[PDB]
Design a protein around this ligand. Structure first.
Ligand SMILES: CC(=O)N[C@@H]1[C@@H](O)[C@H](O[C@@H]2O[C@H](CO)[C@@H](O[C@@H]3O[C@H](CO)[C@@H](O[C@@H]4O[C@H](CO)[C@@H](O)[C@H](O)[C@H]4NC(C)=O)[C@H](O)[C@H]3NC(C)=O)[C@H](O)[C@H]2NC(C)=O)[C@@H](CO)O[C@H]1O
Ligand SMILES: CC(=O)N[C@@H]1[C@@H](O)[C@H](O[C@@H]2O[C@H](CO)[C@@H](O)[C@H](O)[C@H]2NC(C)=O)[C@@H](CO)O[C@H]1O
Ligand SMILES: [Zn+2]
Ligand SMILES: [Zn+2]
Ligand SMILES: [Zn+2]
Ligand SMILES: [Zn+2]
Ligand SMILES: [Zn+2]
Length: 389
């Protein structure tokens, strides 16, 4: 890359209740959109989890009387974004937290890995995307960890062979969503990942919530020796283990949450709580654009480098990232020579000055300007093949 990544996950289910369409992305701030998620079968078959959201939904300017076989849905909307933002690459993300059960089987044989690569790359080239993100949560043992590398090498091989025929000289990107927990990342073939991948999206969040015995920072940088119950994990120990394990610092993109985890009936950070309570869309989880709530004040753990709203009246504490937290995390990643910022996920961000993604863009400065691809002469969709001209 020729600068920092400022990447964001865009969810295909966000077009429904969250009403967040690809045209809603503030694309000027973004180097990579990671389109989430494709589903996976045990025989390695990559499939759409929602054909409506992916390529069937007609937006206002999508003709119900055009000739040929055409892609609509988020695929055409994201191609429009790529046309208007030549420095913005779109990656196809496969798996995710809820859809990782079939990865061990999918990676387990040469035939299943070839089927995974062919079906994944078929979507990528039909939809007019710039690469593939493997979101396998998470390889469980040495067999799975080894098979993950064999799978990534098969995808890399087939991407290079596809480019040689249908996008000569273009480098399709291959990335993973990577775990921040040592129980998970100690099982990975880190040096192999460091060699085969363009980027490792480090999921440096979900450190504490309903699954934690006490209130914790969700995404803190450092251990708090004074209040260690508040920092059950920290980003810094994971980042150092990834780099020392053989992932080059410049390939590590530091993930950051655009949501908070709430703790109810609590005196503060590192302490007893009872329930996670309500959420924006699911129990205990709040969109950043809904934070801080009315009457809550933002406190700061300057050791663990964690911000959290506290409401003295309601006793609600919400761990979440603020614009100031983003400035600190950007200073941190530049200090370690990391590849940039990643965000989960786009729909929850604020607009204007208080955009976490926009704060990251201004704090990073020199963003990746590597050009995307607009030429898909082997796309089965006439409108994509014709670049929506
Ligand atoms: C590799 C890895 O572990 N990545 C982590 C992410 O997976 C994780 O974010 C969470 O991801 C899961 C899917 O993996 C996602 O699940 C979705 O949940 C929503 C409800 O919030 C469902 O949305 C509905 O979809 C239907 C149509 O299918 C709509 O009709 C309806 O309107 C939708 N309702 C709402 C309220 O939006 C999705 O169907 C469902 N998707 C899947 C594929 O199961 C979670 O919401 C994600 N969690 C958060 C907090 O965003 C992430 C954060 O924990 O960590 C990642 O890096
Ligand atoms: C650092 C670490 O290993 N944390 C684990 C958490 O990631 C994980 O919580 C779950 O993480 C998912 C993706 O990161 C979230 O989408 C999901 O909402 C969350 N689960 C719940 C119930 O909130 C848990 C596994 O439950 O283990 C932690 O140790
Ligand atoms: Zn609904
Ligand atoms: Zn139609
Ligand atoms: Zn290359
Ligand atoms: Zn590369
Ligand atoms: Zn800029």
């Amino acid at each position: 890359a020729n600068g920092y990544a400022n990447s964001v996950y865009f969810t295909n289910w966000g077009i429904y209740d969250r009403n967040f369409q690809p045209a809603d992305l503030v694309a000027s701030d973004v180097t990579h959109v990671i389109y989430s998620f494709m589903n996976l079968q045990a025989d390695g078959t990559v499939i759409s989890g929602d054909t409506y959201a992916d390529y069937e939904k007609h937006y206002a300017d999508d003709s119900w009387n055009d000739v040929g076989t055409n892609a609509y849905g988020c695929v055409k909307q994201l191609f429009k974004v790529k046309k208007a933002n030549r420095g913005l690459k779109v990656l196809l993300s496969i798996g995710g937290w809820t859809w990782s059960t079939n990865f061990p089987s999918a990676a387990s044989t040469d035939a299943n890995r070839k089927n995974f690569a062919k079906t994944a790359i078929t979507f990528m080239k039909d939809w007019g995307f710039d690469g593939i993100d493997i979101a396998w949560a998470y390889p469980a043992d040495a067999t799975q960890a080894s098979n993950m590398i064999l799978l990534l090498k098969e995808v890399r091989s087939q991407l290079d062979a596809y480019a040689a025929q249908y996008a000569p000289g273009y480098h399709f990107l291959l990335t993973i969503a990577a775990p921040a927990g040592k129980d998970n990342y100690s099982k990975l073939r880190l040096a192999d990942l460091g060699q085969v991948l363009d980027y490792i999206n480090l999921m440096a969040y979900d450190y504490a919530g309903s699954f934690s015995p006490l209130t914790g920072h969700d995404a803190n940088l450092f251990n708090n020796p004074s209040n260690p119950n508040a920092t059950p994990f920290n980003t810094d120990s994971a980042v150092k283990d990834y780099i020392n394990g053989g992932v080059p610092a410049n390939k590590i993109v530091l993930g950051m949450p655009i949501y908070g985890r709430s703790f109810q009936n609590t005196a503060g950070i590192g302490q007893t709580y009872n329930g996670v309570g309500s959420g924006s869309w699911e129990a205990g989880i709040w969109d950043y654009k809904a934070l801080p709530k009315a009457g809550a004040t933002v406190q700061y753990d300057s050791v663990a480098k964690g911000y959290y709203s506290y409401n003295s009246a309601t006793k609600e504490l919400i761990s979440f990232d603020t614009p100031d937290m983003i400035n600190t995390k950007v200073a941190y990643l530049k200090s370690l020579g990391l590849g940039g910022s990643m965000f989960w996920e786009a729909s929850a961000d604020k607009k204007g000055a208080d955009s976490l993604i926009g704060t990251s863009h201004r704090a990073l400065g020199g963003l990746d300007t590597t050009q995307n691809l607009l030429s898909y002469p082997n796309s089965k969709y006439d409108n994509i093949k014709n670049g929506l001209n």
